[PDB]
């Protein structure tokens, strides 16, 4: 639509970045999407990888 589920719609799977894009789980919203993690873990500064800190 005006926006889309960028969690899915990452272009033609454009993961041209050696990181686990959205390691745990996404959240779609205006502007596209973001991610989060299973509790205890934390989304790192890269905003895609979750670590246990």
Q: Where are the domains of the chain?
A: 1-53
Instruction: Calculate the CA 25 to chain-centre distance.
Output: 7
Q: What technique solved it?
A: NMR
Q: What is the maximum span of the chain, computed from C-alpha positions, in angstroms?
A: 36
Alpha helices in the chain (DSSP H): none
Instruction: Report the alpha-carbon distance of residue 31 to residue 40 in Å, rounded.
Output: 27
CATH class of 1-53: mainly beta
Instruction: Report the alpha-carbon distance of residue 3 to residue 44 in Å, rounded.
Output: 25
Q: Is 29 annotated as a binding residue?
A: yes
Q: Is 5 annotated as a binding residue?
A: no
Instruction: Calculate the CA 27 to chain-centre distance.
Output: 8
Q: Is 3 annotated as a binding residue?
A: yes
Q: Is 32 annotated as a binding residue?
A: yes
């Amino acid at each position: 639509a005006v926006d889309l589920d960028e969690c899915a719609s990452r272009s033609k799977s454009g993961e041209e970045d050696p990181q686990p894009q959205c390691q745990h789980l996404c959240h779609n919203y205006v502007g596209g999407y973001f991610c989060s993690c299973r509790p205890g873990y934390e989304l790192q500064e890269d905003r895609h990888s979750c670590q246990a800190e």
